[PDB]
């Protein structure tokens, strides 16, 4: 077990709301490589049960705030989904920083860190906020299991265990080291990706004409079903008219997350 066995530390942050400090909410690690805006943080606090709260360290005395008074933001605010151990899971948009802050009965405490939270949309309609309804595809999202899937991080005794951080030195008594699981792993699933409007398809002699009116930047992929593919791959944000030549062999057409359609001429 973690919350009944370990202890959080203080550590260096650039911006502790007045220059630097030794911060109770230091950010050691940020991961934003999954698809739909889930970020994972590795803080210098803990998140336990006594029913989901935050235990932090401040000049020896170990403190406690609820998790609802915590607030983190990148360029807009975020929404904490969960916390477990030193780690935390949220729903954050893109920004050139992650910031975190809370308020005891006096001036607020905060920490910011430059890590590029990156929104990584799913599919072939590049979006910025995920869609109400749509088709469903594979998505690797920072899951909500705090169970041991195989990842680990190291830690050590200095009475209680503490993470083996770059912002703290190493004792010389004995390296009584140990390993604790990294929750909030990146797992598969099914996410709801948008569906662009129906393309308008005007025929002609060995010719297709494509009137396209996208709601969002949608990729278009066209090729041929012949020995020479001629693959055209373009991102489209404005309304467009794209004409293509379609032999007796074939011509494949893929607009966003729609399925592939095929066309071939006849005399």
């Amino acid at each position: 077990n973690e919350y009944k066995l370990t202890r959080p530390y203080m550590a260096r942050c650039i911006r502790c709301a007045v220059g630097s400090c030794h911060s109770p909410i230091a950010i050691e690690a940020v991961k934003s490589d999954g698809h739909d805006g889930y970020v994972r943080l590795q803080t210098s606090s803990q998140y336990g049960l006594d029913g989901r709260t935050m235990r932090y360290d401040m000049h020896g005395t170990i403190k406690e705030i609820p998790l609802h008074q915590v607030s983190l933001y990148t360029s807009r605010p975020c929404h904490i989904v969960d916390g477990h151990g030193y780690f935390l899971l949220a729903r954050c948009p893109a920004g050139d920083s992650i910031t975190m802050e809370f308020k005891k009965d006096s001036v607020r405490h905060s920490c910011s860190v430059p890590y590029e939270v990156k929104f990584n949309p799913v599919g072939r309609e590049l979006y910025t906020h995920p869609p109400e309804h749509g088709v469903e595809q594979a998505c690797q999202v920072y899951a909500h299991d705090a169970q041991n899937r195989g990842a680990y991080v190291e830690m050590h005794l200095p009475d209680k265990w503490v993470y083996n951080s770059d912002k703290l030195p190493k004792a010389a008594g004995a390296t009584l080291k140990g390993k604790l699981h990294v929750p909030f792993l990146l797992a598969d699933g099914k996410c709801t990706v948008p569906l662009a409007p129906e393309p308008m398809i005007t025929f002609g002699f060995r010719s297709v004409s494509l009137k396209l009116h996208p709601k969002n930047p949608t990729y278009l992929i066209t090729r041929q079903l012949a020995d020479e593919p001629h693959y055209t791959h373009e991102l489209i944000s404005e309304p467009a008219v794209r004409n293509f030549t379609v032999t007796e062999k074939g011509w494949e057409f893929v607009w966003g997350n729609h399925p592939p359609k095929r066309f071939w001429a006849q005399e």
Binding site: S20, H22, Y152, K170, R223, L225, A226, Y231, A265, Q266
Partner: protein, 401 residues
Amino acid sequence: YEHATTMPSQAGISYNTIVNRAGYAPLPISITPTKIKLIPTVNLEYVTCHYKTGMDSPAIKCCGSQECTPTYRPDEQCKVFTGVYPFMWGGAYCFCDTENTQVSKAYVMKSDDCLADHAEAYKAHTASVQAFLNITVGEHSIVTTVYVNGETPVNFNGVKITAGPLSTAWTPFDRKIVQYAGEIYNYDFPEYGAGQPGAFGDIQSRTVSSSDLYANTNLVLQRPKAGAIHVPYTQAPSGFEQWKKDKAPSLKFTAPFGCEIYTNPIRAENCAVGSIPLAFDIPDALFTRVSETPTLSAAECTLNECVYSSDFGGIATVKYSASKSGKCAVHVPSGTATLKEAAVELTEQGSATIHFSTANIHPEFRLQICTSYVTCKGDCHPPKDHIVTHPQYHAQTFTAA
């Protein structure tokens, strides 16, 4: 009896041929490929994923003098710095102005998520072509899977069928393949130990659960700044991210001959390319002679309505006076047409309709019923929709006018 026919490798389409012996009755063979596969021999080379710059802690000594213990982590850097943790009110709670000593150590391990966010590099060769057929050789119905290497036969009720080889010897799958999220890419991935930073191959484990990884990430430990304890490092961006945000589209969106690429059982299904040969060995039992089939009947064909479309446009009408009211095979020995069915059912003294396809403005195709050579001739009106979604059901010789 033996027969050596050729099938265009194109799924969804039927192939109605016949075996006609000089004395005995015909046999219709309707073979329809439902799927046609193309499976390369894949040999693993390495895997890759994001990296995680592990940072062993500072080893600090106040008015000290340290030495680096050589460890063998992947891309194990190590240094010693002098001066950087000056006095008290200087972070390390050391007494001294200089001759305070830090030892920094930074290694490069694979991500905590490398089990389910990782690319697999592959070397391909030796396509083991393969197929699914829907077969009717003399009033049967089989859904057999078939290899089209010409040594692996199938057997139904005395017949022996053997398919292939020489499906044009083509593959889309280039010598170097990368697999990621079900998508397959023809990237020139570097070997295990030639991967450079900022490229696909900065982290190279032989398997996803090996014991050793190779890390060339361009890491350079830097000097800290007083105020607090820390370990700095300049490192390159991962090449996984950079390949990811700059890769071309997949082989399913850049493949010729209309191939559909698929998953871990790497395969290109439905490549409309080449022609698979079929060699038969039919027995004499299911090869019956005339005495149970109707016969020559003074038949006359007419082409009522012809359109030289890609599909079954034409309708032929045969007026006969036959002995028995039963079944007959039907076929056109030439490529001047392609008929929907192989089995017509003659009544006693009636007529019969035949839906067919063709591509000539002046068809004259030697149509066949049980033993006769009836001859349909006519003219063909042009079509009504010059883009369709139903592919070609004919041969397209230079026979327009």
